[PDB]
Design a protein around this ligand. Structure first.
Ligand code: CHL
Ligand code: CHL
Ligand code: CHL
Ligand code: CHL
Ligand code: CHL
Ligand code: CHL
Ligand code: CHL
Ligand code: CHL
Ligand SMILES: CCCCCCCCCCCCCCCC(=O)OC[C@H](COP(=O)(O)OC[C@@H](O)CO)OC(=O)CCCCCCCCCCCCCCC
Ligand SMILES: CC1=C(/C=C/C(C)=C/C=C/C(C)=C/C=C/C=C(C)/C=C/C=C(C)/C=C/C2=C(C)CCCC2(C)C)C(C)(C)CCC1
Ligand code: SF4
Ligand code: SF4
Lengths: 31, 163, 33, 75, 80, 143, 732, 122
């Protein structure tokens, strides 16, 4: 049974939030 | 190790037969009494003698039909394989100790001369021949020097790097 | 696969658009006085 | 440079010059595969290096076995 | 710039100063050795780091020591 | 003794030019000038490649690096027995006199020089690198 | 001048291109940064560890998501022996149409990559069945990665910044990690296996929505609390059990059957559950050893101080070693990398012979890939362990604080250690190469019966003592009346002796003289790599050629041409030299693994037995013979699915060759060439309008050694990975 | 000092170089960028049209090559823009002058790509 498009968009949004947190940690480690 | 004696191994006999067959196939293109014919016949005789000697030596053969050596001194002694590794080990160790003791004696003798570096590249050939012949009795002198403490330089007399 | 148009957008983005911006910004950063 | 020069000589003469002249024509050693595959690195590596080294790696047990030993020792 | 230090085992043989291609080293008066002079490194901003001075030093271990540090135009030997 | 001043009207050696000379670094960062007084007109080897003819009397050569000037001065002292002076010139026009710094060559010991970089110990008496951790020093040679 | 290396003022004032390279290369060496304190160093390391954990969890989430979205996991679940698992989809606009059809492989998912990581077997074994489960796991792991990123950001805040004493609390960290990070996690994995994975292996569907009402055992937790624990071992899965179905399935949850599941050719799941339960109990017990703040437990300083032999053989013993280990992060990193790399090698050696995942032993490409991957990882990690030991000796070692203990004493006889390592390396190399060359000359002269074929009787004796009856030694597990036989006969010896006396698996393969010769080659590689690394670590502080080497640091180019010449004298250079020998050693190891298993998988065991005894056999019958399909991935007649591996094969050869340039040609040639190029740019009209900000210079000596090593290693790995995957895949 | 050659020091060579838009006596840097972009962006479409992956499809070949040339022009305009922000921290050798030069390069390059497309269509 294949995934749905909404599931992929949900995963992309969660990964975008994770990327925002990654940028925050990278800035905090830099300075 | 699950091996079979080479004297009763079918692979050993098949290998001897195949090698003799290849040499005989090469043999049939030359006339009898010519130099290639004599050389190929000598090779055939050497092949037969070698396979007979390997069978008679008690060598163990694998599934490939090739002799396998036994190097554990226990299995070699209780099953007649000491001539494969153990006796060659004793012979090599004797000759290697001979060479090392002759070199050490030559170096120590050259250390006492006025130009110690001169004897290292211009060899004192009579002295080297005398010292070389005296290397037969190396284990006695070496073991005595080990017991006496004269074999080793003291650690206080050897240079080291800062730690 | 579901949303099969996504490779045709994201592969040019990750392969071309993102490295171009990344090298431009990093070049501007390492040349800053 | 000279390795590439002698490889070029060996492949080109084996492919386009050397061979057996029969009644129909000329059958070359590697059958004219230079013009088909020498324009790629993979063509060189396969059709020249991998294909033509079969003689030196199966030379054991023949008079050419010294070449196999020297091949290994030179590597 | 590279750091050049002179240790008190210097015998004042002036060989390091003669070996230097960028005029980093000189001899100053001293009293700790028989030659009554020691090497000094007042111009380490011109030191390229070639270690010709260490090759010229006869003491064991070396009396002149070059420690490669931060690189400038002069220390990298750049004419451009 | 006083430091000499650079005379920019000093004639240059007879040279046809080369590709090994000055670059943009001379105009924007620094360059170097070596002056010497030749006893006679003769051919010398340029540190940047090729043969040049030095004129009798004073000479002036502009070079990109201090090492080039000192290599030329080594050639002049060893081959032609001629002393020389080396200056550093900045793009604003400021001229810094370099060699010989006090008028005596550095290989000859001269009074009035102060030792810099001297350590009052042998090189095996340097401390361990764990002793200079989180101190800001360059190394055990810096303490 | 510039501000990119903000952690290094010396690099920021560098006017050349060296500032960019060295700024990249020294970014994670936090101890050498400007104005760094110990506390801020530990806090930065803590936050970086959080970032690495987040990267790992995001990588796992990406694997799960791409398999769930573009893979064929349900189709593989239905037919695990005849379906190639899909890694991810291919979208390449440079593809031609034959490339599109070749990578489609007659399917409907478009161009795909066939996975070699073995994630399908693992995820199937742990109970995942559908794409929904993989997608949920990927979402959960992405959330976990975000949580670890936030935790890394949070503990950099001044209120949540841990103090230096918190980082140095060794007893509390060891207690907590042993009890919870190992023991409690192992207990929870036992819970997952008992509640989910074992029921899913028996055809029962257990997920979050019904696991609270599903009994893992019919009798519940009553046998556990009553102390009658043998109930959970009763009625295991029969030999006719089909994985993932209820046919032949038992009810046991904790067994000790041993051997393999007959259908999956893998370890029993109930054995795995009992293993992790016992591991959990042992590790939870081990985490109650060290004193924290409850007045009971051991102090590691007292343990180290007490362990000095009274005869003075070890000098002061282990006195002062607590402060040496605890204050040095490089000592801890070296110990951690040594243990982790050894464990990685253990993982490689145990997953091929005792495969833990269902239908993994039948996937030959996956097994070869996993072994080669983990062995190369272990080699790199061991090299790093010795490198950080050398860094500890340069940077953190205090001779006065370690006066007379085992560290100073092993430094005090380093010449004996290095010379004995040199002797054993020389002996192994001389005699292994001599035996191989003797056998090669015997094969060349047409007389293979004159080969020196030493039987590996010691390892065969070990195999016989573990139950292999083939070699005829009758002892222990191969002796039926022995005590060791009778003790395990009712517990695990039936399955173990079934598996070890079967030649259809990888459990204790039959060995002969070729195995002897290649094992001694492996010993030579290990001993020589150790000799280079150990000599680099022990001469890191100084040698007769450079008695003040500690003053110059771990990495520096040389000491100049004086005193005879001092090229590659730093301890970093010893690491750089040892990477070559490690690559050679792991190459020998993986060559041996792949060729022996290729002969076993093709049904021709005699190919390895009759050709591995001489090196021409290795070349012709392993490299030349098995590269035929790989190099025909694309030809003048067309292409197939192996064309990507042929291209990567050539790619790795090219990268390997490019590294030789950085390793053979050295700096001063290139600096003069770049000087002429910089002249050319300034004198060229229409191009001198543009100008560089950083002055172009040649790469530094150490940087060149690093770049050449990186190209060499990348070409090595890429070439062997392409060859291994193509040669195993094209036949199986 | 500096070596002078007929290649470097001819009246004809210095005359030819002075008439180039990069060396003309008084021209605004935006206009120099415009002529340089027109000439270059006209030229780059040729290899893209005649040798691109769609070169054997009539009609699509010219469009694909001109789109590739426009993409190359955009990439080079970005490279010129980030060059000026770094190199400048002669009106051309200034930050604002190089900004105008980059804008003129982009405008001229797009114009040259469009003119090449029109010429191939006519
Ligand atoms: C590398 C060292 C080494 C190893 C791993 C072995 C291994 C072995 N030896 Mg050998 N040997 C070794 C060095 C030496 N051995 C021997 C002399 C013997 C004897 C006399 C015997 C063995 C026997 C054995 C076997 C059983 C030993 C045992 O512990 O039974 C528990 C086993 C194959 C036995 C045997 O031959 O096979 C069963 C036996 O009787 N060894 C000598 C001379 C002192 C050695 C040096
Ligand atoms: C007098 C001769 C001589 C003796 C007694 C030794 C003794 C030793 N060597 Mg040294 N060596 C000797 C000559 C030479 N060695 C070396 C190079 C090395 C290395 C690189 C190493 C040793 C090591 C060792 C030790 C271990 C045994 C070994 O590894 O053999 C191996 C010996 C060789 C590989 C070279 C042997 C060449 C030849 C057979 C010996 C020289 C013969 C003389 C020319 C004979 C002259 C006598 C005449 C004039 C009467 C042992 C202390 C190892 C170590 O230190 O162990 C702790 C070690 O790693 N040797 C060279 C340069 C090739 C030599 C010439
Ligand atoms: C480190 C994990 C990771 C790796 C190596 C890949 C690899 C790939 N992804 Mg996949 N992904 C990964 C995580 C995840 N991705 C996705 C969602 C997608 C989509 C929707 C697509 C890809 C695509 C691709 C391919 C082309 C690159 C691309 O355009 O990505 C773009 C991906 C994103 C913009 C989101 C993921 C970013 C990723 C988490 C960053 C990880 C960075 C590392 C931690 C540090 C470096 C390539 C095979 C394409 C395709 O499937 O193949 C042709 C594509 O269309 N990924 C999710 C769920 C949101 C992940 C978790
Ligand atoms: C993942 C990265 C990546 C992607 C998605 C592509 C995609 C493409 N490449 Mg490949 N490239 C990529 C990385 C690399 N390329 C190459 C080397 C090449 C070459 C040598 C060629 C390609 C060409 C192509 C095209 C082939 C399809 C076609 O038929 O064109 C049909 C094309 C069109 C119909 C017109 C396309 C116009 C284009 C979309 C304009 C794009 C403008 C930019 C996005 C502007 C960027 C501004 C900012 C963001 C920097 C396609 C656009 C071929 C070509 O077609 O392009 C010149 C070509 O000759 N690539 C290298 C060097 C190793 C890369 C690294
Ligand atoms: C006869 C009684 C007796 C025996 C046999 C031992 C035996 C031992 N005690 Mg002692 N003890 C004994 C009585 C008592 N002890 C102690 C109290 C202690 C303490 C407190 C400690 C010992 C330790 C030790 C060990 C090390 C001692 C030593 O000096 O190592 C000398 C070691 C060397 C000189 C180095 C040797 C290195 C070797 C040559 C390296 C070789 C490497 C290989 C070449 C490479 C690998 C090859 C491959 C094939 C493996 C050793 C096992 C220590 C220990 O280890 O505990 C476990 C320790 O801390 N004992 C008490 C009072 C309670 C006793 C009454
Ligand atoms: C958990 C493990 C671990 C940790 C925390 C550290 C931490 C550290 N290391 Mg140790 N290392 C570790 C494992 C390993 N180390 C080493 C060997 C070393 C050495 C020899 C040195 C360190 C140094 C350092 C420090 C500085 C790191 C740095 O600046 O990176 C900079 C990182 C780079 C420049 C990365 C570039 C190299 C990388 C291999 C590129 C890979 C690219 C691929 C080839 C691309 C392939 C795909 C292509 C084809 C598309 C830092 C304390 C240095 C030291 O402590 O200071 C004196 C140092 O000299 N490490 C190896 C063997 C490879 C390991 C495995
Ligand atoms: C095939 C390639 C290759 C070979 C044969 C060697 C050989 C050796 N390495 Mg070298 N290396 C090789 C590649 C590389 N290595 C290194 C880096 C190192 C390091 C860093 C070290 C070694 C050491 C060793 C020795 C390992 C001990 C041993 O095996 O003794 C057996 C000796 C051999 C196998 C050498 C060959 C012997 C020869 C066949 C004997 C016969 C000679 C002929 C009869 C002479 C004929 C002459 C002609 C003119 C008639 C050995 C001398 C280690 C060592 O020096 O200490 C022990 C060491 O520390 N290697 C790099 C990276 C730079 C390589 C690429
Ligand atoms: C790989 C090089 C290359 C290729 C394949 C092309 C291809 C083309 N050019 Mg170009 N150009 C190329 C580089 C260069 N061009 C030119 C100068 C010109 C001009 C001035 C013109 C062409 C034109 C043409 C077209 C001529 C068609 C034909 O004659 O039949 C064709 C599309 C002509 C076309 O009609 O407009 C695009 C046109 O007017 N080329 C120069 C000199 C600086 C180049 C270097
Ligand atoms: C025979 C046993 C005695 C050997 C001599 C004992 C002797 O030489 O003492 C040296 C050392 C024991 O030293 P300690 O200082 O622990 O003990 C002093 C001894 O003299 C016993 O009082 O033993 C070893 O290193 C060899 C035993 C390792 C055995 C490992 C077994 C596992
Ligand atoms: C330099 C240095 C360092 C480093 C080092 C290293 C890196 C090492 C490694 C090491 C290693 C890598 C090791 C390993 C080892 C192992 C072992 C030692 C093992 C053992 C084992 C055993 C004991 C077992 C037994 C058994 C059993 C139990 C069962 C049956 C079988 C057998 C018998 C096998 C450090 C940091 C410390 C410090 C500084 C200096
Ligand atoms: S390293 Fe070279 S430049 Fe520096 S002081 Fe020594 S000789 Fe002079
Ligand atoms: S070469 Fe050495 S000993 Fe001589 S003056 Fe210089 S530093 Fe002193």
């Amino acid at each position: 049974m294949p995934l749905s498009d909404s599931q992929i968009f949900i995963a992309l949004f969660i990964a975008l939030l994770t990327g925002i947190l990654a940028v925050r940690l990278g800035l905090e480690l830099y300075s | 190790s699950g091996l079979t004696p080479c004297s009763e191994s079918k692979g050993f006999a098949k290998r001897q037969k195949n090698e003799i067959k290849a040499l005989t196939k090469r043999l049939k293109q030359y006339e009898e009494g010519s130099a290639p014919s004599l050389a190929l016949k000598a090779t055939i005789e050497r092949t037969e003698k070698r396979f007979a000697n390997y069978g008679n030596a008690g060598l163990l053969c694998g599934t490939d039909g090739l002799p396998h050596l036994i190097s554990d001194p226990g299995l070699a002694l209780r099953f007649g394989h000491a001539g494969e590794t153990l006796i060659p080990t004793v012979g090599f160790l004797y000759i290697a100790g001979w060479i090392g003791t002759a070199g050490r004696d030559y170096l120590i003798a050259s250390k006492g001369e006025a130009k110690p570096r001169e004897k290292e590249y211009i060899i004192d050939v009579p002295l080297a021949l005398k010292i070389s012949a005296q290397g037969a009795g190396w284990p006695f002198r070496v073991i005595r020097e080990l017991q006496k403490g004269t074999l080793l330089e003291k650690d206080s007399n050897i240079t080291v790097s800062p730690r | 696969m579901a949303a099969a148009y996504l490779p045709s957008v994201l592969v040019p983005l990750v392969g071309l658009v993102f490295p171009a911006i990344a090298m431009a910004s990093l070049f501007l950063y390492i040349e800053k006085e | 440079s000279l390795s590439i020069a002698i490889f070029h000589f060996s492949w080109k003469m084996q492919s386009d010059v050397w061979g057996t002249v029969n009644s129909t024509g000329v059958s070359h050693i590697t059958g004219g595969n230079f013009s088909q595959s020498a324009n790629t690195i993979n063509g060189w590596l396969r059709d020249f290096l991998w294909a033509q080294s079969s003689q030196v790696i199966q030379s054991y047990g023949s008079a050419l076995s010294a070449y196999g030993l020297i091949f290994l020792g030179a590597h | 710039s590279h750091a050049v230090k002179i240790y008190d085992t210097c015998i004042g043989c002036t060989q390091c100063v003669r070996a230097c291609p960028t005029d980093v080293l000189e001899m100053v008066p001293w009293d700790g050795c028989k030659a009554s002079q020691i090497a000094s490194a007042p111009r380490t901003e011109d030191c390229v780091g070639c270690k010709r001075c260490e090759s010229a030093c006869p003491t064991d271990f070396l009396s002149v020591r070059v420690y490669l540090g931060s690189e400038t135009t002069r220390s990298m030997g750049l004419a451009y | 003794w006083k430091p000499p001043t650079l005379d920019p009207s000093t004639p240059s050696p007879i040279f046809g030019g080369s590709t090994g000379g000055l670059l943009r670094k001379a105009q924007i960062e620094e360059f170097y000038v070596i002056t010497w007084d030749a006893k006679k007109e003769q051919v010398f080897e340029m540190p940047t490649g090729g043969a040049a003819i030095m004129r009798s009397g004073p000479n002036l050569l502009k070079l990109a690096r201090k090492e080039q000037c000192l290599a030329l001065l080594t050639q002049l002292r060893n081959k032609f027995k001629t002393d020389g002076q080396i200056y550093r010139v900045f793009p604003d026009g400021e001229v810094q006199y370099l060699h010989p710094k006090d008028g005596v060559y550095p290989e000859k010991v001269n009074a009035g020089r102060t030792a810099v970089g001297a350590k009052d110990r042998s090189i095996g008496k340097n401390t361990n690198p764990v002793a200079v951790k989180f101190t800001g020093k360059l190394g055990t040679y810096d303490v | 001048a510039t501000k990119f290396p903000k952690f290094s003022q010396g690099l920021a004032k560098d006017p050349t291109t060296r500032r960019i390279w060295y700024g990249i290369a020294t970014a994670h060496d936090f101890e050498s940064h400007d104005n760094i304190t110990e506390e801020s160093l530990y806090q930065k390391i803590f936050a970086s560890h959080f970032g690495q954990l987040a990267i790992i969890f995001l990588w796992t989430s990406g694997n799960l998501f791409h398999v769930a979205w573009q893979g064929n996991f349900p189709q593989w679940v239905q037919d695990p022996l005849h379906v190639r698992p899909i890694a991810h989809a291919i979208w390449d606009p440079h593809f031609g149409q034959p490339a599109v059809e070749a990578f489609t492989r007659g399917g409907a998912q478009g161009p795909v990559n066939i996975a070699t990581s073995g994630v399908y077997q693992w995820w199937y074994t742990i109970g995942l069945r559908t794409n929904q489960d993989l997608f949920q796991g990927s979402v959960f792991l992405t959330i976990l990665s975000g949580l670890f990123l936030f935790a890394g950001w949070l503990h950099l805040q001044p209120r949540f910044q841990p103090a230096l004493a918190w980082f140095k609390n060794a007893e509390s960290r060891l207690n907590h990690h042993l009890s919870g990070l190992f023991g409690v996690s192992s207990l929870a994995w036992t819970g997952h296996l008992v509640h989910v994975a074992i029921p899913e292996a028996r055809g029962q569907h257990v997920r979050w929505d019904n696991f609270l009402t599903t009994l893992p055992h019919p009798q519940g937790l009553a046998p556990f609390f009553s102390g009658n624990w043998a109930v959970y071992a009763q009625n295991p899965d029969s030999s006719a059990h089909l994985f993932g179905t209820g046919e032949g399935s038992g009810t046991a949850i904790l067994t000790f059957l041993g051997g393999f599941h007959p259908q999956t050719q893998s370890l029993w799941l109930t054995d795995i559950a009992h293993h992790h339960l016992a591991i959990a109990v042992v590790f939870i017990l081990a985490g109650h050893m060290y004193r924290t703040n409850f007045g009971i437990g051991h102090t590691m300083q007292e343990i180290l101080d007490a362990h000095t032999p009274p005869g003075g053989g070890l000098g002061a013993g282990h006195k002062g070693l607590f402060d040496t280990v605890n204050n040095s992060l490089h000592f801890q990193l070296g110990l951690a990398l040594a243990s982790v790399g050894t464990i990685t090698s253990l993982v490689a050696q145990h997953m091929y012979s005792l495969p833990p995942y269902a239908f993994l032993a039948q996937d030959f490409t996956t097994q070869a890939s996993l072994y080669t991957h983990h062995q190369y990882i272990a080699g790199f990690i061991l090299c790093g362990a010795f490198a950080h030991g050398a860094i500890f000796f340069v940077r953190d070692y205090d001779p006065e604080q370690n006066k007379g203990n085992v560290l100073a004493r092993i430094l005090d006889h380093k010449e004996a250690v290095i010379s004995h390592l040199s002797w054993v390396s020389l002996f192994l190399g001389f005699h292994t190469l001599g035996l191989y060359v003797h056998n090669d000359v015997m094969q060349a002269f047409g007389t293979p019966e004159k080969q020196i074929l030493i039987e590996p009787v010691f390892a065969q004796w070990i195999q016989a003592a573990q139950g292999k009856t083939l070699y005829g030694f009758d002892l222990l597990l191969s002796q039926s009346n022995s005590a060791a036989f009778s003790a395990g006969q009712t517990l695990w010896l039936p399955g173990w002796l079934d598996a070890i006396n079967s030649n259809s698996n990888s459990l204790f393969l039959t060995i002969g003289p070729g195995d002897f010769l290649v094992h001694h080659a492996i010993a030579l590689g290990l001993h020589t790599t150790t000799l280079i690394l150990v000599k680099g670590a022990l001469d890191a502080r100084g040698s007769k050629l450079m008695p003040d080497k500690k003053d110059f640091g771990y990495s520096f180019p040389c000491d100049g041409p004086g005193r005879g010449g001092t090229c590659d004298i730093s301890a970093w250079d010893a690491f750089y030299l040892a990477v070559f020998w490690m690559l050679n050693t792991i190459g020998w190891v993986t060559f041996y693994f792949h060729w022996k298993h290729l002969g076993i998988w093709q049904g021709n065991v005699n190919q390895f037995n009759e050709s591995s005894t001489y090196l021409m056999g290795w070349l012709r019958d392993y490299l030349w013979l098995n590269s035929s399909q790989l190099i025909n991935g694309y030809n003048p007649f067309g292409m197939n699915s192996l064309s990507v591996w042929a291209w990567m094969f050539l790619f790795g050869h090219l990268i390997y060759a490019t590294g030789f340039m950085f390793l053979i040609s050295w700096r001063g040639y290139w600096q003069e060439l770049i000087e002429t190029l910089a002249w050319a740019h300034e004198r060229t009209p229409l191009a001198n309008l543009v100008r560089w900000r950083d002055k172009p210079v040649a790469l530094s000596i150490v940087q060149a050694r690093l770049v050449g090593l990186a190209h060499f290693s990348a070409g090595y790995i890429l070439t062997y990975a392409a060859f291994l995957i193509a040669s195993t895949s094209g036949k199986f | 000092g500096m070596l002078e050659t007929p290649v470097t020091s001819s009246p004809l060579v210095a005359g030819f170089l002075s008439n180039l838009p990069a060396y003309r006596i008084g021209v605004s840097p935006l206009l120099r960028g415009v002529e340089i972009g027109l000439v270059h962006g006209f030229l780059v479409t040729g290899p893209f049209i005649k040798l691109g992956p769609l070169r054997n499809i009539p009609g699509v070949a010219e469009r694909a090559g001109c789109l590739s040339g426009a993409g190359l022009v955009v990439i080079l305009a970005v490279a010129l823009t980030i060059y000026g922000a770094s190199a400048f921290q002669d009106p051309l050798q200034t930050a604002d002058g190089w900004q105008k030069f980059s804008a003129g390069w982009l405008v001229g390059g797009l114009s040259g790509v469009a003119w090449a497309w029109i010429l191939t269509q006519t």
